[PDB]
Design a protein around this motif. Sequence first.
Motif, PDB file in Angstrom:
ATOM      1  N   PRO A   1      43.599  56.912  66.586  1.00 49.34           N
ATOM      2  CA  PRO A   1      42.310  56.829  65.914  1.00 49.34           C
ATOM      3  C   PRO A   1      41.407  55.803  66.567  1.00 49.34           C
ATOM      4  CG  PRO A   1      44.114  56.196  64.443  1.00 49.34           C
ATOM      5  CD  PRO A   1      44.726  56.529  65.717  1.00 49.34           C
ATOM      6  N   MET A   2      40.129  55.899  66.286  1.00 48.62           N
ATOM      7  CA  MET A   2      39.237  54.833  66.729  1.00 48.62           C
ATOM      8  C   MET A   2      38.676  54.089  65.557  1.00 48.62           C
ATOM      9  SD  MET A   2      35.644  56.667  67.827  1.00 48.62           S
ATOM     10  CE  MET A   2      34.724  55.153  67.904  1.00 48.62           C
ATOM     11  N   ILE A   3      38.129  52.946  65.907  1.00 45.85           N
ATOM     12  CA  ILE A   3      37.548  52.046  64.947  1.00 45.85           C
ATOM     13  C   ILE A   3      36.557  52.802  64.076  1.00 45.85           C
ATOM     14  CG2 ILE A   3      35.829  51.326  66.702  1.00 45.85           C
ATOM     15  CD1 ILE A   3      35.825  48.563  65.237  1.00 45.85           C
ATOM     16  N   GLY A   4      36.663  52.576  62.771  1.00 44.78           N
ATOM     17  CA  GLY A   4      35.801  53.225  61.821  1.00 44.78           C
ATOM     18  C   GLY A   4      36.272  54.562  61.340  1.00 44.78           C
ATOM     19  N   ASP A   5      37.308  55.139  61.939  1.00 39.14           N
ATOM     20  CA  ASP A   5      37.791  56.423  61.466  1.00 39.14           C
ATOM     21  C   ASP A   5      38.384  56.281  60.069  1.00 39.14           C
ATOM     22  OD1 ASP A   5      37.110  57.830  63.765  1.00 39.14           O
ATOM     23  OD2 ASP A   5      39.231  57.979  64.479  1.00 39.14           O
ATOM     24  N   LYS A   6      38.237  57.353  59.286  1.00 39.76           N
ATOM     25  CA  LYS A   6      38.950  57.477  58.037  1.00 39.76           C
ATOM     26  C   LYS A   6      40.365  57.909  58.351  1.00 39.76           C
ATOM     27  CE  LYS A   6      38.113  59.705  53.463  1.00 39.76           C
ATOM     28  NZ  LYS A   6      37.125  60.590  52.781  1.00 39.76           N
ATOM     29  N   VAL A   7      41.340  57.078  57.997  1.00 41.31           N
ATOM     30  CA  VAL A   7      42.743  57.363  58.264  1.00 41.31           C
ATOM     31  C   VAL A   7      43.448  57.619  56.942  1.00 41.31           C
ATOM     32  CG1 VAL A   7      42.795  56.138  60.507  1.00 41.31           C
ATOM     33  CG2 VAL A   7      43.453  54.906  58.404  1.00 41.31           C
ATOM     34  N   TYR A   8      44.385  58.555  56.985  1.00 41.11           N
ATOM     35  CA  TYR A   8      45.183  58.970  55.846  1.00 41.11           C
ATOM     36  C   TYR A   8      46.622  58.660  56.177  1.00 41.11           C
ATOM     37  CZ  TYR A   8      41.170  61.810  54.463  1.00 41.11           C
ATOM     38  OH  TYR A   8      39.907  62.262  54.113  1.00 41.11           O
ATOM     39  N   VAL A   9      47.279  57.846  55.367  1.00 41.08           N
ATOM     40  CA  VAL A   9      48.657  57.470  55.648  1.00 41.08           C
ATOM     41  C   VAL A   9      49.518  57.590  54.403  1.00 41.08           C
ATOM     42  CG1 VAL A   9      48.031  55.814  57.465  1.00 41.08           C
ATOM     43  CG2 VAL A   9      48.481  54.983  55.166  1.00 41.08           C
ATOM     44  N   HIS A  10      50.801  57.825  54.630  1.00 37.98           N
ATOM     45  CA  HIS A  10      51.821  57.571  53.625  1.00 37.98           C
ATOM     46  C   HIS A  10      52.637  56.367  54.068  1.00 37.98           C
ATOM     47  CE1 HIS A  10      51.668  60.179  50.247  1.00 37.98           C
ATOM     48  NE2 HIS A  10      51.682  61.294  50.958  1.00 37.98           N
ATOM     49  N   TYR A  11      53.077  55.560  53.109  1.00 43.85           N
ATOM     50  CA  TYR A  11      53.813  54.371  53.455  1.00 43.85           C
ATOM     51  C   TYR A  11      54.726  53.923  52.338  1.00 43.85           C
ATOM     52  CZ  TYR A  11      50.802  51.657  50.316  1.00 43.85           C
ATOM     53  OH  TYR A  11      50.091  51.207  49.229  1.00 43.85           O
ATOM     54  N   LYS A  12      55.695  53.102  52.716  1.00 41.93           N
ATOM     55  CA  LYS A  12      56.434  52.285  51.765  1.00 41.93           C
ATOM     56  C   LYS A  12      56.524  50.881  52.351  1.00 41.93           C
ATOM     57  CE  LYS A  12      60.755  54.206  53.286  1.00 41.93           C
ATOM     58  NZ  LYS A  12      62.238  54.050  53.284  1.00 41.93           N
ATOM     59  N   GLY A  13      56.524  49.904  51.459  1.00 47.68           N
ATOM     60  CA  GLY A  13      56.658  48.507  51.839  1.00 47.68           C
ATOM     61  C   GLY A  13      57.838  47.862  51.155  1.00 47.68           C
ATOM     62  N   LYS A  14      58.508  46.981  51.899  1.00 52.18           N
ATOM     63  CA  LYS A  14      59.625  46.172  51.409  1.00 52.18           C
ATOM     64  C   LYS A  14      59.394  44.700  51.702  1.00 52.18           C
ATOM     65  CE  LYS A  14      63.371  47.888  53.311  1.00 52.18           C
ATOM     66  NZ  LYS A  14      64.822  48.264  53.308  1.00 52.18           N
ATOM     67  N   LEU A  15      59.840  43.859  50.771  1.00 51.81           N
ATOM     68  CA  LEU A  15      59.882  42.427  50.966  1.00 51.81           C
ATOM     69  C   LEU A  15      61.184  42.033  51.653  1.00 51.81           C
ATOM     70  CD1 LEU A  15      58.727  41.084  47.498  1.00 51.81           C
ATOM     71  CD2 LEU A  15      57.336  41.492  49.533  1.00 51.81           C
ATOM     72  N   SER A  16      61.230  40.789  52.108  1.00 52.03           N
ATOM     73  CA  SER A  16      62.397  40.290  52.813  1.00 52.03           C
ATOM     74  C   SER A  16      63.581  39.995  51.905  1.00 52.03           C
ATOM     75  CB  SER A  16      62.030  39.060  53.603  1.00 52.03           C
ATOM     76  OG  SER A  16      61.454  38.068  52.753  1.00 52.03           O
ATOM     77  N   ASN A  17      63.388  40.133  50.606  1.00 48.61           N
ATOM     78  CA  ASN A  17      64.506  40.103  49.660  1.00 48.61           C
ATOM     79  C   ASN A  17      65.091  41.478  49.371  1.00 48.61           C
ATOM     80  OD1 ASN A  17      62.704  41.313  47.958  1.00 48.61           O
ATOM     81  ND2 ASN A  17      62.637  39.558  46.513  1.00 48.61           N
ATOM     82  N   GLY A  18      64.631  42.463  50.136  1.00 49.54           N
ATOM     83  CA  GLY A  18      65.192  43.791  50.056  1.00 49.54           C
ATOM     84  C   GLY A  18      64.507  44.713  49.064  1.00 49.54           C
ATOM     85  N   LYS A  19      63.559  44.210  48.299  1.00 52.98           N
ATOM     86  CA  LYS A  19      62.959  45.090  47.294  1.00 52.98           C
ATOM     87  C   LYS A  19      61.747  45.870  47.809  1.00 52.98           C
ATOM     88  CE  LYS A  19      64.666  42.828  43.135  1.00 52.98           C
ATOM     89  NZ  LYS A  19      64.281  41.987  41.967  1.00 52.98           N
ATOM     90  N   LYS A  20      61.698  47.155  47.443  1.00 56.70           N
ATOM     91  CA  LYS A  20      60.514  47.989  47.661  1.00 56.70           C
ATOM     92  C   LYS A  20      59.469  47.369  46.753  1.00 56.70           C
ATOM     93  CE  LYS A  20      60.154  52.214  45.738  1.00 56.70           C
ATOM     94  NZ  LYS A  20      60.376  53.681  45.644  1.00 56.70           N
ATOM     95  N   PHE A  21      58.263  47.106  47.268  1.00 56.91           N
ATOM     96  CA  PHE A  21      57.153  46.636  46.445  1.00 56.91           C
ATOM     97  C   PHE A  21      56.012  47.635  46.330  1.00 56.91           C
ATOM     98  CE2 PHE A  21      56.007  45.057  50.635  1.00 56.91           C
ATOM     99  CZ  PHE A  21      54.651  45.295  50.691  1.00 56.91           C
ATOM    100  N   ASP A  22      55.961  48.666  47.168  1.00 56.08           N
ATOM    101  CA  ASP A  22      54.903  49.651  47.043  1.00 56.08           C
ATOM    102  C   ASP A  22      55.315  50.917  47.789  1.00 56.08           C
ATOM    103  OD1 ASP A  22      52.398  50.679  46.383  1.00 56.08           O
ATOM    104  OD2 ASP A  22      51.282  49.431  47.794  1.00 56.08           O
ATOM    105  N   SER A  23      54.716  52.024  47.378  1.00 53.31           N
ATOM    106  CA  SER A  23      54.938  53.339  47.983  1.00 53.31           C
ATOM    107  C   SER A  23      53.825  54.293  47.614  1.00 53.31           C
ATOM    108  CB  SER A  23      56.229  53.940  47.459  1.00 53.31           C
ATOM    109  OG  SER A  23      56.303  55.303  47.816  1.00 53.31           O
ATOM    110  N   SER A  24      53.188  54.889  48.614  1.00 58.29           N
ATOM    111  CA  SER A  24      52.237  55.952  48.335  1.00 58.29           C
ATOM    112  C   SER A  24      52.935  57.252  47.975  1.00 58.29           C
ATOM    113  CB  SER A  24      51.316  56.165  49.515  1.00 58.29           C
ATOM    114  OG  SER A  24      52.057  56.518  50.672  1.00 58.29           O
ATOM    115  N   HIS A  25      54.113  57.480  48.542  1.00 59.12           N
ATOM    116  CA  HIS A  25      54.859  58.685  48.250  1.00 59.12           C
ATOM    117  C   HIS A  25      55.081  58.808  46.736  1.00 59.12           C
ATOM    118  CE1 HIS A  25      55.999  59.338  52.518  1.00 59.12           C
ATOM    119  NE2 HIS A  25      56.170  58.024  52.575  1.00 59.12           N
ATOM    120  N   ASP A  26      55.405  57.689  46.090  1.00 62.71           N
ATOM    121  CA  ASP A  26      55.689  57.669  44.675  1.00 62.71           C
ATOM    122  C   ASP A  26      54.425  57.959  43.819  1.00 62.71           C
ATOM    123  OD1 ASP A  26      58.346  57.087  45.257  1.00 62.71           O
ATOM    124  OD2 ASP A  26      58.125  54.927  44.885  1.00 62.71           O
TER     125      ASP A  26
END
Length: 128
Positions: A35-60
């Motif tokens: 992509p280039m700067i300014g593009d509208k981007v569509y993503v799916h993601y999940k995030g984890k903290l360093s204590n092992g816990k999922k803190f966010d998910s778009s899939h969910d």
Amino acid sequence: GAPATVTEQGEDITSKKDRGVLKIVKRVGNGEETPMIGDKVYVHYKGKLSNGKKFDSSHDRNEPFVFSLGKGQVIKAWDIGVATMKKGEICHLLCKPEYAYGSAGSLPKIPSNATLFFEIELLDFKGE
């Protein structure tokens, strides 16, 4: 696990070469264009903290996360990392706090000085 692997085996994608954002390409995407700067981007993601816990998910949420690339609408690591991705790519990003929420964190979920792990899929990008 995957966070350890990107920590130990990932590529530094920072311009500063300060190892603040490390990446592994998990699924190879389409062709060569990113992509280039300014593009509208569509993503799916999940995030984890360093204590092992999922803190966010778009899939969910059953909906992608949509933002304009390179505008500071997201943490620095995401502007840097998503800019490197091809359509259809899945990657892992390891984000040191200087490229995320720093000493402030972001209450309630993200502590001070947090290194973050993401799995990100670039679904689509388009100019407006």
